[PDB]
């Protein structure tokens, strides 16, 4: 069903990611230079606050500035509704692409197929530019989003594009702010692949757990310290299924980066994303030998202190003929 009041569609798990990307890009979508994806809780309850508004308005502005794609849940619940509202607001004041994936099974007031109009057991936002529903079946609304969104992100990550330096590749950064366990599972699977994640060290209950982490008894104590009601409700047997995951979160500190709550800088969003992305290139070792791509990447991302301290530093024979092209740029 296609609805306009943006494009809509029904998604099947078996559908190949390459075919979906080809559809998107060829038909309605331009080449992607960045894929900022926000992962949070789909629960209606959210910790709305002025700080939460400020920590996301800058993100939206950066996404527009670089032309990045924004992937979200997109079911008109808390953070997702705010994201849709901010996308609309930016459109009012040269377009933003916001794909929102949800589960078909949960969908209520189903209107099967041709431009049917729906007016109104899952509610869906109508502000997203593109909205996708995926459920091969099981109308009981089981978790199905993870089976397709992660595969799409990984495929786009491997898709090489000769632009924005970064070894002719695409960033594919994950941004975590919600307190849901689904967010924890998404973080685990993303860490499984070569995708750096940045977590907010603020109101997020589970995000605060991960922030404090950076000794299973300490893990249990930290988990108890946050969301005590959920900790008590969960059975003891299932607790293991979480503890191991936390270890995987703390398995590698190279990728995981977090923001400082105390910092009140206006450009903290850009700086954090830039640093987290930069670490992945530095540690990848694919282009670590290459000493010119690093500077070209660091230039586009406004970072003077990092460029001065790391790129040039000392004991490097760049010579006067090394800066020609980068200085021109």
């Amino acid at each position: 069903g296609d609805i306009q009041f943006g494009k809509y569609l029904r998604l099947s798990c078996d559908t190949d990611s390459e075919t979906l990307y080809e559809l998107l890009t060829q038909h309605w979508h331009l080449k992607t230079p960045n894929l900022v994806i926000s992962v949070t809780g789909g629960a209606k309850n959210f910790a709305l606050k002025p700080r939460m508004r400020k920590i996301f308005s800058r993100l939206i502005y950066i996404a527009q500035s670089k032309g990045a794609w924004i992937l979200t849940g997109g079911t008109h619940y808390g953070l997702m509704k705010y994201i849709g509202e901010v996308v609309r607001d930016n459109t009012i004041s040269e377009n933003i692409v916001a794909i929102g994936i949800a589960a078909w099974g949960m969908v209520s007031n189903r209107d099967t197929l041709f431009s049917a109009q729906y007016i109104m057991l899952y509610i869906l936002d109508n502000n997203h530019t593109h909205l996708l529903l995926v459920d091969n079946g099981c109308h009981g609304h089981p978790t199905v989003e993870a089976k397709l969104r992660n595969q799409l992100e990984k495929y786009i990550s491997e898709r090489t594009s000769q632009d924005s330096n970064y070894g002719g590749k695409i960033p594919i950064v994950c941004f975590a702010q919600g307190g849901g366990r689904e967010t924890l599972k998404a973080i685990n699977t993303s860490v499984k692949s070569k995708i750096p994640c940045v977590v907010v060290e603020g109101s997020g209950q589970i995000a605060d757990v991960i922030a404090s982490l950076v000794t299973s008894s300490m893990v249990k104590e930290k988990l108890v310290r946050f969301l005590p009601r959920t900790v008590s409700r969960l059975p003891e047997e299932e607790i293991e299924s979480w503890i191991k995951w936390l270890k995987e979160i703390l398995e590698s500190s190279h990728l995981l980066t977090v923001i400082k709550m105390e910092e009140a800088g206006d450009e903290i969003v850009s700086n954090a994303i830039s640093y987290a992305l930069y670490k992945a290139f530095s540690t990848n070792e694919q282009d670590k030998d290459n000493w010119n791509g690093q500077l070209k990447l660091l230039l586009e991302w406004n970072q003077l202190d990092l460029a001065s301290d790391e790129i040039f530093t000392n004991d490097r024979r760049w010579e006067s003929a090394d800066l020609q092209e980068v200085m021109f740029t």
Binding site: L9, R10, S12, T15, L23, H27
Partner: peptide, 11 residues
């Protein structure tokens, strides 16, 4: 073309 692509995607 769009109809054919939609049909192929649906399978």
């Amino acid at each position: 073309d769009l109809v054919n692509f939609i049909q192929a995607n649906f399978k």
